[PDB]
């Protein structure tokens, strides 16, 4: 009824592209595929599930404290993802058989075809199929929230989508985006919530719903929503479409100096968005107008979302669950490298697969 130990697969090595790879036997024919700086990803079979994987070989990992403490953030977020519209966890795991000799970590999840930019290069998207990658992705952020947890930068290259339309999030724990990364031109900044891109106040699950709207309106109009060439030019075009902040929402940001700012600015009423999405199915438009509110208290949740009639045809309470709790006290805890070192490893070698 129990089971008190573990039983190790065997390994084999094996260099692909300048660098070593251990692996399970498990795993067969590795095919370098790319990177991201984080580490070198191989698309891979996995015999034992039947499945076509990625193997990530995670990069220096334990370099420094801030690189350490990464690396379990990381594991930590994937290892707690349980949801089909929500990038989980496959395996993990290290050839090491001490934390002795401890030192690389492997991360194995679905093989991803396509994300939301390659769908929408490849053909034009109907507004059904608007509501249904809408709905997968309110499902998820449903099910994110539940336990606390922000994704904090929602992006078509973070949506994976198949050839039947089914849809995961992707990239959770990642190294923060650096100012460099968010200056100008830039896709990594134009589904940002306008609260932390100008830091106005402390953020919560809410930015997530913006970015959904920019999303949303993108797959719609088939046009980027805000894409402004620098913060400020991007806030213009927000305050254009969204007003000019009244005094209830001036007075819950922090700051002063963007209070002082946004105060300079010429006043501008809302637009109506009928007219700005012209001829968009009017369910669309109106769940766009509860999610483009400057005001983050006053956006609408994805729970509420889920109910909205825009997803009449996929929406049952019954087929919407919730998480269980995420504890982030780590995220306050100041350690030593060894220690994050130490917690991670912990992490990989109690890993249980899935059913």
Same mark, same amino acid.
């Given at each position: 009824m129990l089971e008190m130990s573990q039983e190790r697969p065997t390994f084999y090595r094996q260099e692909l592209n300048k660098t070593i790879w251990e692996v399970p036997e498990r795993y067969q024919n590795l095919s370098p595929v790319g990177s991201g700086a984080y580490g070198s990803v191989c698309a891979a079979f996995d015999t034992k599930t039947g499945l076509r994987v990625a193997v990530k070989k995670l990069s220096r990992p334990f370099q420094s404290i801030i690189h350490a403490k990464r690396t379990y953030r990381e594991l930590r977020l994937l290892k707690h993802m349980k949801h089909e519209n929500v990038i989980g966890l496959l395996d993990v795991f290290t050839p090491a058989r001490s934390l002795e000799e401890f030192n690389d970590v492997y991360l194995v999840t679905h093989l991803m075809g396509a994300d939301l930019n390659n769908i929408v290069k490849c053909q034009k998207l109907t507004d059904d199929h608007v509501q249904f990658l809408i709905y997968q992705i309110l499902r998820g952020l449903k099910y994110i929230h539940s336990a606390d947890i922000i994704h904090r930068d929602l992006k078509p290259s973070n949506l994976a989508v198949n050839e039947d339309c089914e849809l995961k999030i992707l990239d959770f724990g990642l190294a923060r985006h650096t100012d460099d990364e968010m200056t100008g031109y830039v896709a990594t900044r134009w589904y940002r919530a306008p609260e932390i891109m100008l830091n106005w106040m402390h953020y919560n699950q809410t930015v997530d719903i913006w970015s959904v709207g920019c999303i949303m309106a993108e797959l719609l109009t088939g046009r980027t929503l805000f894409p402004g060439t620098d913060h400020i030019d991007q806030l213009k075009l927000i305050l254009r479409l969204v007003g000019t902040p009244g005094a209830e929402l001036l007075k819950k940001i922090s700051s002063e100096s963007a209070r002082n700012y946004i105060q300079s600015l010429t006043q501008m009423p809302k637009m109506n968005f009928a007219n700005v999405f012209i001829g968009a199915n009017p369910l669309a438009v109106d769940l766009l107008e509860k999610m483009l509110?400057? !005001?983050? !208290?006053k956006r609408i949740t994805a729970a509420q979302a889920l109910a909205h009639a825009y997803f009449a045809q996929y929406h049952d309470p019954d087929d919407e669950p919730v998480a269980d709790p995420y504890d982030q006290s780590f995220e306050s805890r100041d350690l030593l490298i060894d220690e994050w070192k130490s917690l991670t490893y912990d992490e990989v070698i109690s890993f249980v697969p899935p059913p």
């Open positions: 509110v400057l !005001d983050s !208290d």
